[PDB]
Each structure stands twice: as C-alpha cells, then as structure tokens.
Design an enzyme around this catalytic site. Structure first.
Site, PDB file in Angstrom:
ATOM      1  N   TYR A 272       0.805  -1.243   0.000  1.00  0.00           N
ATOM      2  CA  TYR A 272       0.000   0.000   0.000  1.00  0.00           C
ATOM      3  C   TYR A 272       0.834   1.288   0.000  1.00  0.00           C
ATOM      4  O   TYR A 272       0.326   2.376   0.300  1.00  0.00           O
ATOM      5  CB  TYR A 272      -1.037   0.031   1.153  1.00  0.00           C
ATOM      6  N   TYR A 495     -14.016   2.210  -4.018  1.00  0.00           N
ATOM      7  CA  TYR A 495     -12.758   1.545  -3.651  1.00  0.00           C
ATOM      8  C   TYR A 495     -12.327   0.545  -4.726  1.00  0.00           C
ATOM      9  O   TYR A 495     -13.143  -0.250  -5.202  1.00  0.00           O
ATOM     10  CB  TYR A 495     -12.899   0.852  -2.287  1.00  0.00           C
ATOM     11  N   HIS A 496     -11.039   0.615  -5.080  1.00  0.00           N
ATOM     12  CA  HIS A 496     -10.363  -0.202  -6.107  1.00  0.00           C
ATOM     13  C   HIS A 496     -10.663   0.226  -7.551  1.00  0.00           C
ATOM     14  O   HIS A 496     -10.662  -0.596  -8.472  1.00  0.00           O
ATOM     15  CB  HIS A 496     -10.584  -1.722  -5.914  1.00  0.00           C
ATOM     16  N   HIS A 581      -5.336   2.438  -6.227  1.00  0.00           N
ATOM     17  CA  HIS A 581      -5.755   2.963  -4.912  1.00  0.00           C
ATOM     18  C   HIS A 581      -5.613   4.487  -4.725  1.00  0.00           C
ATOM     19  O   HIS A 581      -5.093   4.946  -3.699  1.00  0.00           O
ATOM     20  CB  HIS A 581      -4.996   2.239  -3.785  1.00  0.00           C
TER      21      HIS A 581
HETATM   22 CU   LIG Z   1      -6.788  -2.516  -1.666  1.00  0.00          CU
END
Ligand SMILES: [Cu+2]
Ligand code: NA
Length: 639
Positions: A272, A495-496, A581
């Site tokens: 991340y 998200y994503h 992200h």
């Molecule tokens: Cu993720």
C-alpha cells in the site's frame, strides 16, 4: 458476483430472433424463466457453424435501457460460453449504429453483465463474436434487459459518457503501454478476489483503443502477486511494480518487447506504499504497512542501471504519518509523492504536515510546513488525490479525502501548492470554494489544456460497499480558478477504481470492488469524451494533425521541430500515468512555449531541469484556436 444498475423488464410480450437454433434448444428457451433450459446453436446433424452468432430482442414498446445480463448453461458443460461480444440498441430494428458495450467475459458459469448509460430503445441485440475456449457454439440459459427509472438527455457542452468496455477481471490497478497505446490492467491471483493468496501469480488484461480487442494473460515468471503495489515508470522506460501480497518482490514491465522481467527484492517488505520516479531516473519509495508487517518503514531507492535496492534509513517516515484510528497499519499509506529537483521528492500529504525527502547519502527529511489557507489548517485527507498540472511553475492541486481510511466522512477541501527550491516552505492557498461534492476513493487525471478531471468516489468511506455514491464528475480550470460540473454517469466507481488518460485525449475510468462473494464487483470500464472534442452542433470536431517530428527521442534541454496541417495556438507535454488505490505519481504536465517558424512549422524546448521534466515516456498534444486537441505523438525524454 456482480450486480446490475437497473430493474428487470417484463418478458411477457417479447419476440426473439436467432441465427441458428436446435430442436429442444429453441430461441425462446432463453426467456422462459427456467434456469435449467437453454438456447443452443446448430450442432451434430445440422453441422457446426462458427461464430459470430446473434440474439435479437423485440420489446414491442420503447424502454429506458441501461444494461443486460447473460446467465450461461448450468449443466456443467463448457460448450457455449460467450467470450468476445458486442451489445447494440435500436428504435427501428434495421439501423443499429455503434456498440454501447463491447469486450470480453471470463471463462466460467457465473452470471455475466453489461452495464451502460441510459438510452431509449425498443430493440436490443447481443452478438457473440467468439466462444471462451474457441469452439463453434454459443449458449444462453437466461437473458434479461434492465431499465432505469427515468431518462434525461445529456446537457450540451458538458461531455459524454460511453461506450462501456466489458472485462474478464476487476481492474484494481492499471498503466498505459506507451509504445503500443494499449491499457494494461491487473487484479490479483483471481479475477474477483485477493484474500488467501498462495503467492507468485497475477492475472493481467489489456485493451487496445484502435481495435477494441480485450486479451488476457497469466504472469508467473516474476513470482509476484501484484495486488496493492507502488507503481513507477523509471528512466530506462520500464514500469516498476513493488510489493503487495508478495511484500518483498519487484516486477518490471518492458513496453517495447511486451513482457515481464524479474526485478531484485526490496530491502523492506511493503504494501500500500507510493513510489516516485526521481530526477536521475531512479525510484524512491517510503512507508506501506498494508502488508509485510506493521513497523517503521523508512525510504529506499532503486537503481535501473545496477539493478539494486539500497536502504535510506535517515529519510524518516515519522513526520509524514496521519492520525488514523487504526494506527500505523494505515498512517503511512498512499503518500502524495512527486519527483523534484536535485534528487528530491516532495510529499504533499495525505497528512497535514508536508515534507521534503532527500536521496543523497543515507537520506534526509525537512519540514515543508502545514497544508493550509486563510480558511484554516487542513486536516488529514487519506485517499484524496494530488495532481501536478503545471510542472514548470510547480503547481499541485490537492482535493478530497477523509481523516481515516475507513468509516469516516469526506470533505470538500481543495488546495493549490506552489513549489520552489528544495528546503523552502511552499505557498498554499485554497482552490476556489472547493469541490461541489465531498468525495474519497475517487480518481483523477490531467487533461491537455491544463484542466484536472475528477470522477467517482463516495461521501463516506466504507470499502466494498456502494453506499452514498457521487455520479457527477468535476473539472478544474486553473486560469479561471473555477470548478465545473460535467454530465453524470450510472456506474459506481468507489474503492479499487482507476482513471487513465488515453493517447487520443479521452479518459478511461473503471474498476471498483474485488471482494469475491460481494455484489459490488465491477468487471467493466467506461470512456469519457470531454467538451474539447465537440463543436457547436454537438458532433465530433475536426482535430489538427502532427504530420512530422524531427526526433522521437530527446534529451533535457534539447529542441524538437514539428509540422502541422493547420494553425495551432497552444501545445503541451503530458507524462504517461499509472493508477492504483487513488495514487498516480507518474502523471504531470509541461506547458510549451512555441516559436513560429512559418508554414505551419513550430519549435519548442524541453526543460533543462530533469526534476521538472522527469525521464520516461511523454505525450505531445497540440491545440488549435477552437481548443480542439490532436492525438498524441510518443516522445521519450532522457538525461
Ligand atoms: Cu486494496
Ligand atoms: Na431458460
């Protein structure tokens, strides 16, 4: 699993037509309501006709169509799974036009979907170009068409959404291949999930803008599961993908040969994290406690020439941490990194405190002040974007985000950061009155004219859930210091999700989900065509053409001479982006100062400082007096 964007239309008065249908497996055996019966094309005694195979529907009356579903045969047989396809809509039944949805579906027995923008039609058509395994047949168990509650025609001058690109995977990560023009996308070890990975495998998919073909691949040679990484394009023209599910690994993608080459392991195991390309062509990365453990992960640098990773422990991660409720697991994630002068890297956020990172020796860090304005001190903005629209004047636009990663409200916060020399605190002011809609998990790209396209997101950050979505996109024009609302879409991009600028000047927006058994998986992507490509009548305007270039490869400080077919006013250089992200550290724009040589011949200089003009691949766009841009010419900048 996935889910449709509308409600099912009654199939009581439907009239269906097929190109080929067997006895017992008729054309109407796809609209009866039985999950066990199916339509099937000619086989055995009637011969084996090869695809394209067609299924045409007549709904008798006009409906506000926004999507369709295809349920394959549930008897355990592979014979007939639809691979490559095309969806058409009509009002008369003879003139179909351009496809509203096209692409490829995965090779399994799960329910497949095609979600597109609302358009009134009476006739729907599904053309099956190929079969998933390359066999002569086509079979459908249940076919449904979905509708929206109402229709509202798109407002003139605010852009257009469409067509939809159906994909076999959920694109949580993406990058553009410069030499071919294709869009490279990837998920994880599976097409719809990431949890419980054995490691060493990534499923990739590519889309070609000129042909429309979607081709999938399986990468095992690099021994890396590329979910949740740090992406950067180095000076040698290779894409550096680091960490994630296989936290210590590095993968290199070469665009010229279209292959994946194994890279050396990192010193610290990360996940991340954000990575950024430096002035010398090297790649810097910091933080990332998403995977590989939760501890203090300081900076490290990659050298493309020597193929090594060297640790820089004095480039402290402590002053860039957010005050996240989940602690260090989320606080060092998604840093707003930008490669700048003399090997330095600027950290614009997400934390309140901005910092300067140095790469000489064992590294260093210095405070660049707090991100603020006259409206007060700006709070932590996790998963908010940061885009550099003018690299010559060091202009960075920051927007959105929430204090915590999850279960937190997003804000309308927007700032303009002006960069100078490394070590000095930059000037920070508020961008207009902020965003129209508060959003987090949103994505953005820099357009040829200096404007920034903002799309997707949600008001409250709740991962794997499509709650409180933002359908209306925003464009920021710097010369006027104003935000403009564009025409809305119908698919939720939370998200994503990713967003990339295509060489033709349009925007590729897709992804969202990647949770397996969830109904929030989006196996698609949509194309946005901005206002600059349209005229006064609302049709596609005539675009200027770059007929000749003096060189395709240039050094920092060098000149390029071009030739056009018409008179141009402005010109720009946009670096090819990579997205995952909400992070995109590769994109940036350089406004060009033109010299008129006469006879539609122009000259310009690429900036001498490699911190402004980062080495790699760039896009050359020229605009006429009407503001209409050309298609991109690939220019490689070296040092
Ligand atoms: Cu993720
Ligand atoms: Na059926």
């Amino acid at each position: 699993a996935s889910a449709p964007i509308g409600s099912a239309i009654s199939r009581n008065n439907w009239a269906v037509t097929c190109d080929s249908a067997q006895s017992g497996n008729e054309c109407n055996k796809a609209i009866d309501g039985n999950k066990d019966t199916f339509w099937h094309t000619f086989y055995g005694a009637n011969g084996d006709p090869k695809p394209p195979h067609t299924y045409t529907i007549d709904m008798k009356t006009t409906q506000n169509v926004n999507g369709l579903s295809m349920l394959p045969r549930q008897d355990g047989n592979q014979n007939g799974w639809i691979g490559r396809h095309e969806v058409y809509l009509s009002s008369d039944g003879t003139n179909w036009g351009s496809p509203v949805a096209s692409g490829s579906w995965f090779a399994d027995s799960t329910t497949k979907y095609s979600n597109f923008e609302t358009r009134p039609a009476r006739y729907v058509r599904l053309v099956a170009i190929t079969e998933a395994n390359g066999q002569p047949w086509t079979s459908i168990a249940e076919i449904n068409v979905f509708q929206a509650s109402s229709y509202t025609a798109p407002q003139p001058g605010l852009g257009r959404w469409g067509p939809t690109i159906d994909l076999p995977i959920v694109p949580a990560a993406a990058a553009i291949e410069p030499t071919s023009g294709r869009v490279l996308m990837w998920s994880s070890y599976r097409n719809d999930a990431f949890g419980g990975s054995p490691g060493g495998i990534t499923l990739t998919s590519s889309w070609d803008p000129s042909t429309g073909i979607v081709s999938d691949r399986t990468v095992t040679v690099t021994k890396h599961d590329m979910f949740c990484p740090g992406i950067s394009m180095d000076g040698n023209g290779q894409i550096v993908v680091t960490g994630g599910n296989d936290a210590k690994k590095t993968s290199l993608y070469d665009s010229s040969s279209d292959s994946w080459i194994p890279g050396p392991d990192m010193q610290v195991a990360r996940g991340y994290q954000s990575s950024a390309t430096m002035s010398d062509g090297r790649v810097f990365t910091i933080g990332g406690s998403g995977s590989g453990g939760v501890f203090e992960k300081n900076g490290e640098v990659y050298s493309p020439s020597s193929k090594t990773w060297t640790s820089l422990p004095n480039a402290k991660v402590n002053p860039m941490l957010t005050a996240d409720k989940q602690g260090l697991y989320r606080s060092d994630n998604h840093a707003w990194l930008f490669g700048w002068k003399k090997g330095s890297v600027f950290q614009a956020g997400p934390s309140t405190a901005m910092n300067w990172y140095y790469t000489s020796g064992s590294g260093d860090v210095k405070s660049a002040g707090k991100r603020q304005s006259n409206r007060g001190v700006a709070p932590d903005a996790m998963c908010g974007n940061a885009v550099m629209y003018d690299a010559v004047k060091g202009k960075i636009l920051t927007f959105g985000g929430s204090p915590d990663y999850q279960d937190s409200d997003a804000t309308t916060n927007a700032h303009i950061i002006t960069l100078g020399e490394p070590g000095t605190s930059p000037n920070t002011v508020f961008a207009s009155n902020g965003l129209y809609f508060a959003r987090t998990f949103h994505t953005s790209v820099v357009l040829p004219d200096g404007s920034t396209f903002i799309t997707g997101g949600q008001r409250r950050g709740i991962p794997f859930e499509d709650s409180t979505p933002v359908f209306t996109p925003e464009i920021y024009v710097p010369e006027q210091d104003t935000f403009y609302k564009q025409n809305p879409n119908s698919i939720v991009r939370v998200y994503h999700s990713i967003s990339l600028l295509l060489p033709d000047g349009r925007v590729f927006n897709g992804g969202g989900g990647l949770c397996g058994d969830c109904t929030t998986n989006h196996f698609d992507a949509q194309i946005f065509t901005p206002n600059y490509l349209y005229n006064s009548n609302g049709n596609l305007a005539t675009r200027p053409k770059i007929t000749r270039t003096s060189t395709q490869s240039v050094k920092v400080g060098g000149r390029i001479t071009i030739s056009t077919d018409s008179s141009i006013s402005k010109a720009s250089l946009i670096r090819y982006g990579t997205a995952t992200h909400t992070v995109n550290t590769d994109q940036r724009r350089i406004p060009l100062t033109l010299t008129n040589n006469g006879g539609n011949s122009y000259s310009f200089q690429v900036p001498s400082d490699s911190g402004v003009a980062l080495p790699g691949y760039w896009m050359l766009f020229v605009m006429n007096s009407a503001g209409v841009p050309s298609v991109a010419s690939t220019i490689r900048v070296t040092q």
